Every structure is written in C-alpha cells, then in structure tokens.
Specification:
Chain B: Its main location: secreted. The complex is a heteroheptamer, with 2 copies of chain A, 2 copies of chain B, 1 copy of chain C and 2 copies of chain D. Chain A is an all-beta fold. Chain A is built from no helices and 20 strands. Chain B starts with 7 loop residues before the first helix and ends in a 5-residue tail after the last strand. Chain B is mainly beta. The chains are: A mainly beta, B mainly beta, C alpha+beta, D mainly beta. β1 of chain C pairs parallel with β7 of chain E, so a sheet runs across the interface. The structure holds ligand 63P. The ligand CNC(=O)[C@H]1Cc2ccc(cc2)NC(=O)[C@@H](NC(=O)c2ccnn2C)Cc2cc(ccc2Cl)Oc2ccc(cc2)C2(CCCC2)CC(=O)N1 sits at the interface of chains E and B.
Chain lengths: 220, 91, 14, 213, 89, 220, 213
C-alpha cells in the first residue's frame, strides 16, 4: 500500500526558511515523478513544484520560483521541499503527491501545516465553562472549556483522558482580529451526574508544548 | 533485484521481464537481464502494435571470472538493462 | 597499493 | 500558463445525475490528461478519476470522467447522486511545464432535513475575571442548513464591538456548529444587568441570557 | 557508433560526457531523454506518456582520499530511455 | 552508406549443406533486424528467414523450417544462413536485407547464387570472336569472347581488366538442353585501333575457381 | 499465414497515372506496414515505398503509397509515368512471425517506338576448330518489341538441329537482347559454302552470313 508521510511543517517568520520532507513507502520510489501541492485554510488546491523520478527535471509554480527548491533522495525514498524567503501568503497545508507521469497525480499524503507569520508561538489559557441553571434544561447540563488565545493551529481537546466521548462537541476555532485563535469544547451530561462525576478537559497545544488538564465543576 | 528498485519494466510501452543469470565462477554471481515481453509495443488502446518494436537496450560491462575454470580474468559481457520502443519512421 | 573491496567480493576470492 | 474554470457551486437533488465541468483557457484540453479529486472537510484529497476517465478501485461506478475537445472542457459525472457525495471537487491537468488545479466546486445535495440549533451561553469564568479579562461564549450546534445569524445585546442594547463569530462548519453528524465570542472588560461585564446571545436560524430566533455573580 | 536506438526510439535520447579524473573510467557517456513526452504515430511529442531514463547500477574505481589506494564505488548511470504511460494494460 | 555483401553461394548436391555470409557496413549493425530473401530465376521474391538485432529472436518461412539456421556475429558485423538438407527447389539468388523493424526491409544486398543440382561443376572453354571485315561497321568494329559450356552460373566478364567499359555488351547466358550454360561478350571498338590495341576478355567462373584472360586479335 | 495478391501485369501510356494493388488474404492490412520494391532486369530490388507511404530520398515524387482498410489492400501509384518506370514491382508486409511478398507485377509503359535489331554473326574460331568443335554465334540486340524469330541456314537450307536460342531479355534501355548458337562438327562447317543467321523482327529481316576459311 502506497504511503506518503510529510514532516517538517511549523511556524516561521517572513523571510525565514523551512525544509519539508515526505517519506515514501509501498512503491518503487525512484520510478515516480513527485509533486508538492498546497492549500491555504478554506481555499483551493495550488500546485507548487514537481520533480522527475531521477531528479533530473524540476518544475515550479511562478509564485515560488527562485524561493523554493524541490529535491529527492532515491536511496532514502524521500522527497524534500526547501522553502526559503517565506512570506505570509505561503501559509498552507503542504501535500506530497505521487505522479504516474508529469501532471497525473495518483496518491496524496496527509499534509504538513506551514504557518508563516510575524506573530510568535503562544500557548493558550484554559478556563472552565462551569455548568449552571442557565446551561441546564430537560435533564441535561452543558459544561465546557474555553481554550483562549493560542497560536499557531492546531489544538486538541479530550475529556477525562478520552474515557468521555458521548455528548462531546469541540468547536472549530475562531481566528480573532488579534491574529490569535480561540476554541471551546463542550460536553452535555445528565444533570444528576454534576458534583458526583468528575469532568476534566485535557487540552494539548503541541506548537507551544502546552498540556492543561482543567477540572470543570459547578460553581458555589 | 531491479523489480524492487524500479517498476518501469511494467509501465513501459515496451515492457520487459527480468531473468536471473547464475554463474558461481563469475563475480557478480547473479546478473539480472531484461527480456522484452512483446515483439511490438503497447499502443494507446492497450494492444500490441506491430508498427513498432520493443528492443533491448544493452550495456558493455566488465566482469570477474575464475580462469582456469589464485588467478582472475576481467571479461567484457553485454547485458540487457531494459527495453525501448523503436519505429521505422524517424521524426 | 590499497584497494577497498566489499565483503562479498573477498568471500568469492576465498 | 493556463487556467481551469469550474462552477463555484452545484446543488442537486438525490438520485439525479450531476455534471461538474472544467474549462481550459489556453492549450488543447485533449493533449493532456485530466484528473478529478474529491475533498471532504478536514481530509486529504482522494482521486475520483485519473487519465480523463480511469476509475481506481474503491471509487463507485456512479463516478465517470469525460472530455469534450470542441468546448475544450472536461466533465465529472455522478449518477444516482447520494448525500455522501457532498464534498469539494477539483479538476486538474497540466502542460509540458506546469500543473494546474481548477478553483474547485462545492457540491451540495438537496432535500436534507432542517434541524434547529441547540444554543448555550456561558458567562466569564472566575479565573478569567481574576486575570482582568472577560469572554462570553455562545455555542451553537446541530443546525441544518448552515446559515445562522448571531447578535449580541448588553442589557437590551445591540453590541458589535468585541464580537468574533466563526463561519459555521459541518460536524461528524453532518449538521453544522458555530461559536461566537464577546470580549468585554470585567467593568463592562459587572456594569450591565445582563448580556444576551440571539441566534437566528430559518426565520426563528432563540435568545440566551447571562448575568454577573 | 555501436547503436542508433537513441535516434529511432519513441523516447529518443542524447548522450552526454561525464568527466572525472579521480574516477576510472574517467569518461562515462550518459543518456539524457530528449523530450518529456514520447513521439507518437504522427511524429508529435505526446504528453499522455513520458520518456524516462533506464538506469543501471555499475561499479567504478575511485581515488579515495581525493596515488596508492582505490575504492570500488557503486554508481547509477542512464543507459537509454523508455516510454511510460499512466495506464497499465 | 549502407553496404551488404553476400558470399558463400555456389553448387551443392541435393541433401548437401552450405553456409552463406553477409558482411554489413555503413550502419550500427547490432541495432538492426536482418533478413534473408531468395529469388529463383524468373520467379518472385520469397522471404526465407529473419533475426532480431540482438540475435535473441529468429523467424523462418515454412518451406525452410528445421533445415536452415539464421545467426549473426555482431562483433564481426556478419549475418549467416546455414542451410542443411538442400533440395533443387532451394536454387535461387539469396539476398541479405536490413530491416528497420520486423518485416520492414529498407536495404538489399547484391545477392549470391545458390544452385542445388546433382550435375558436376564445369569450367568454361573461352574462345576469341575475332574482328574481321564481316564484323566492321566503318569506324567501329565488334570483337568478342565466347564462354562455352560452364556450370553452374554465374560468370562475369570484363575487358582489359576493367579499363575498357565503353561499348561492352555481355549477353545473358543460354541454358542448353545439356544443362550447361554458354554466353558471349562483345565490345565495339575503333576500327583504327585493331592490331595496335590489345583486347583481352577477363572471364571469371568462381564456381570452378577458374579465371581466363583471352587475347582477341584480328585473324590473318 | 497469409498471401498478398497483385496483378500479373499493369500497362499505361507515358505521362499517365498507374495504380498497382496488393490484397491481403487474412489479417488486417492496417495492423502492419506495407513496403513496395522495384526490380529492374538483372538487378537487386530497390525500395520505392516503406511504412505504407514513406518515400526515401532518390525516389521520384511521382511514386506514392496508400492503404485501403475496407478492401484490405495497399496501392502503389505512379503519376506522370515515364519509360524508365518499366520494371517488376513487389508489395511486402508481415504478421508477428512471418514476412510475405506479393507475386509481383510487371509494369509495361505503352507506345514505345519499334526498334530494329543489331545483328552480329561470328564464325567458329581457329582455336575451337582445332579442339574438334564448331560454334556459330549470332548476337541480337536493341530490338523493340521483344518478339524475334531466329532462323539458321546451311547454304540455302533451313537448319534446326544443334541450335540453342535464348528467350529475349530486357536491357537497361527497355529494348531487348537475344543470342543464338549453332553447334556443328568441323566437317559440317567445312562442307558448306556458307551458313546464315536470319533474324526477323516486326516483319523485317536481317540476314548475316559467314563462310569457312
Ligand atoms: C559508453 N560507455 C561508457 O561511457 C562506459 C560505461 C561503463 C560501463 C561499465 C562500467 C563503467 C562504465 N563498469 C564495469 O563494467 C564494472 N562492472 C560492473 O559494474 C558490473 C559487473 C556486473 N554487473 N555490473 C554492474 C567493472 C569495472 C570496470 C572498470 C573500472 C572499475 C570497475 Cl569496478 O573499468 C572499465 C574499463 C572499460 C570499460 C568500462 C569500465 C568499457 C565498458 C566495458 C569495456 C569497455 C568502456 C567504458 O568506459 N564504458
């Protein structure tokens, strides 16, 4: 089975550099042309660069010429994208792709997120969203966690270390005018379980190495 | 084995099979040789087309041999590396 | 004179 | 260089045949193979069609590709349209140097049931107020269709300053979710009798209210 | 001078001299595909297929460190080109 | 320039063997498929055998299967045809041919005559055909050589070792009811050159390893 | 296996267009390239057309090749026919194993002028007579058309015994040559006053005579 595993994405300042890797397995790597394609959040797919099986021929989109370099190591089954002179507009998920011939992509990787911004890494502050009479109705109570002001994406939230999945709703993040993200995660529980069952939200913001386990309880 | 390094043998319009040539009195002992699968080439519709021919691409390579069958002799041998498609009309 | 040869080649010589 | 033009969106009813076209601006469409990709929310693209009309294993027989040299366009046809076919579709081709994707087509499948939103409003936490900050969180979930209007009130007065609302996005249950945040100072929070989040969906408005202490 | 398949192939190639004084043989002739596509029935470069080099792993002699000692190195050389298609029949 | 030179033809007894050679030059021999094609006197062309450039694939007409073997030596730029169990019906001129692909012949050699017969070789008796007042046409006079009773074909005739070519007419041989051949060669020369210029016909009959240089002079 | 059928002969006047067809008995003609060869008297074949319609350099623009899949036949067309086009023409094609030639077509260019033969008669040489043999050699050249009558006379009497005459053969200039040999004993040669070779062509006769000593 064809596997394409991208690595190397993260947060970089404009003018900065970053090297992406794509580790290929499940096919004879040296006999395939390879490509990089990117996608900015909520936007379309944009071709970046391509390389022949041998590495002898390389191709670039006008938007990245002179700044990016595609290369490959056929002994290591790896495709690279050296990205220099980065700018805000290069922010995107970058996908590695296997081509049957030049321009015919057959397989896509999972992608690696590249963020180019003048803002620096910021771990979130995690606040409990306590259950109350205003978050209750028809035997259910809503409780949650506010994951405020983090950068860059992504964050992950679980409840009670993954043991609580029923009634969980983690919302998509808001991008504030400040340039920072915020998200919330809520769980709807039987109102009779409040002050009997412990509810903890487990927040992880891997870009800033922030892990927060916040206990959420009724207020008194 | 070249099957594990490249799959052009299966994707080419002049596909080929790889055959193991064994010789204990020669170094390397095993040499993989390409043998064209068809006389014609595979066209756009997937058919063997006889307006063209699959031909082996050969390379002159030096090999080590134990002669008489302390001493070693360097021998020149021709090996088929793959196949290409040739046509009688040159453009 | 030193000639760096792989393990498989020397094994074949002996 | 060249462009590929696709419709921004297509809406069709289930069981029907839908066609997504892809027009090449310059260069002969028939000289280069056309690929079609499907992309579901938060997922990598998958190939639906490659080399104009080749369908990989795992792709339903309902999907087919064709090309029309006279109009310099390629088409992705979906027969017996299903709600699971909802996704973004991109056409892609090339020339001897470049590779180009179309802008993408958002495919909508009509006739899905309307679902009213579940709304919860949380006041600022004690911890945040102590940090001299205050955020009201209005969570909106399980609604269909995705169009929703969010308005905030300080007592009975509309408030636009400090509000950040997400564009609604599909959940795993195929309904939408959205959130709205109202940023206030602790002084603004404590000086009003209440704050409300008003959510309008399909002509009905639900209002949730929170008050200090 | 030994073969003219380089000119008669649907994936024709040119031969380029790779020079290295610290390697034996000093000169190695390498195939470089003339086109990205392959030559079709009408004599046109067709981009529904690609000309790709066929590479061979060959042992060479090298002077390491860069007059007395040598190292046997495995190198990859392009012998010719073949035409590949994205549809396997 | 493409050159294909056949050798090896001559007389064979029925049931006998013979090997033909074809020396090729002016092209990269190993990259061409080669063929043998034969032609019996006054009959059509008949494909005999073919061989791929590498020698890896061989093809035979039904009329010669099992009996003939086509082979090539790419280091010597030579094509061979080994013929065993020869029969009278194999009598023909054998041509070597260069093919661009299997079945597309682009160049032909000069041919080599193979005669399969139980009749014995016979070298020619060469007689002068002297010019006289009965062979003169004013300023020009005809003189010649009679090449009598030889077997098998062919004979070649030149005059004055090839220095005399203008006015030469070598006639096709007669096949006598005896099974022997006879031919004549005539040259028209200036009548003033008779008894001043030496005229010699050079007759070569390779099948009997005979060469005859006959001096032709006026009779008195 | 398969056959290729061609007409035994084709004829046309100079400056006109002539077509030679070649019909394949089994297998599709369009799957395999068709070659056409010209063969002049006493010469190796030369290629006129290869790969259906390719004309090598040195071959006049007047020669062209075509194929007709509906009739499973190939054609050699000669426009602006010249006298120098008189020759035998063979079509050739193949299958994945075999190579086949057609039976050949003799091309005759009509309206060529009548040409009287040049006749030379030689008596037996002194050397041959000494070897107890005697041959009279009658050489006939440059006649057109090819039909010729050769008769021998011992004095005025017709001779049929001991005569060997060739069938007329085509020369490189389109005219014909022939030879006739009369074998005698030295006694028969010496016992007659003369011998004659009488050559009749198109109703006109040329008679050459030789006599002993
Ligand atoms: C157009 N042609 C060219 O440009 C090159 C192309 C080439 C071809 C072959 C090799 C190198 C290059 N190398 C081998 O054959 C090696 N064996 C192998 O790799 C080998 C043995 C078995 N399976 N494999 C892969 C042995 C070897 C040979 C050496 C040195 C070191 C070693 Cl370890 O010296 C040489 C002397 C002569 C030549 C090549 C190399 C010839 C080609 C054969 C005879 C003439 C000319 C010339 O330069 N040709």
């Amino acid at each position: 089975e064809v596997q394409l595993l991208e690595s190397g994405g993260g947060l970089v300042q404009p003018g900065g550099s970053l090297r992406l890797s794509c580790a290929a397995s499940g096919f004879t790597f040296s006999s395939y042309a390879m490509s990089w394609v990117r996608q900015a959040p909520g936007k379309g797919l944009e071709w970046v660069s391509a390389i022949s099986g041998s590495g002898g021929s390389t191709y670039y989109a006008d938007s990245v010429k002179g700044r990016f370099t595609i290369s490959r190591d056929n002994s290591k089954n790896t495709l690279y994208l050296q990205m220099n002179s980065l700018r805000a507009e290069d922010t995107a998920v970058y996908y590695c792709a296997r081509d049957l011939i030049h321009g015919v992509t057959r397989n896509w990787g999972q992608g690696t997120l590249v963020t180019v911004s003048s803002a620096s890494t910021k771990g979130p502050s995690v606040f409990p969203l306590a259950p109350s009479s205003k978050s209750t109705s028809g035997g259910t109570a809503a409780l949650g966690c506010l994951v405020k002001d983090y950068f860059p994406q992504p964050v992950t939230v679980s409840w009670n270390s993954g043991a609580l999945t029923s009634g969980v709703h983690t919302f998509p993040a808001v991008l504030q005018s400040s340039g920072l993200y915020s998200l919330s995660s809520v769980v709807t529980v039987p109102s009779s379980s409040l002050g009997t069952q412990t509810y903890i939200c487990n927040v992880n913001h891997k870009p800033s190495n922030t892990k927060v386990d916040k206990k959420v309880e009724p207020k008194s | 084995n070249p099957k594990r390094s490249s799959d052009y043998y299966n994707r080419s319009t002049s596909p080929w099979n790889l055959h193991r040539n064994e010789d204990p009195e020669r170094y390397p002992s095993v040499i993989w040789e390409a043998k064209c699968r068809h006389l014609g080439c595979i066209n756009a519709d997937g058919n063997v087309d006889y307006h063209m021919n699959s031909v082996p691409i050969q390379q002159e390579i030096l090999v080590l041999r134990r002669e008489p069958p302390n001493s070693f002799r360097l021998e020149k041998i021709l090996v088929s590396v793959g196949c290409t498609c040739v046509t009688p009309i040159v453009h | 004179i030193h000639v760096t040869i792989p393990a498989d080649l020397w094994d074949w010589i002996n | 260089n060249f462009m590929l033009t696709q419709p921004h969106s297509v809406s069709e009813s289930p069981g029907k045949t839908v066609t997504i076209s892809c027009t090449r601006s310059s260069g002969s469409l028939a000289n280069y193979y056309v690929q079609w990709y499907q992309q579901r929310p938060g997922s990598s693209p998958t190939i639906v069609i490659f080399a104009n009309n080749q369908r990989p294993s795992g792709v339903p027989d309902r999907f087919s590709g064709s090309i029309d040299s006279s109009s310099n366009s390629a088409s992705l046809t979906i027969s017996g349209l299903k709600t699971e076919d909802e996704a973004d579709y991109y056409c892609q081709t090339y020339d001897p140097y470049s590779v180009v994707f179309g802008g993408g087509t958002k495919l909508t499948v009509l006739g899905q049931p309307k679902a009213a939103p579940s709304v919860t409003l949380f006041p600022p936490s004690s911890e945040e107020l102590q940090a001299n900050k205050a955020t009201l969180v209005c969570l909106i979930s399980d609604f269909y269709p995705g169009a929703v209007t969010v308005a905030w009130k300080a007592d009975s007065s509309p408030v636009k300053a400090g509000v950040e609302t997400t564009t609604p996005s599909k959940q795993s249950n195929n309904k939408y979710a959205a959130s709205s945040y109202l940023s206030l100072t602790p002084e603004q929070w404590k000086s009003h009798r209440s704050y409300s989040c008003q959510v309008t969906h399909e002509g009905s408005t639900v209002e949730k209210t929170v008050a200090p202490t």
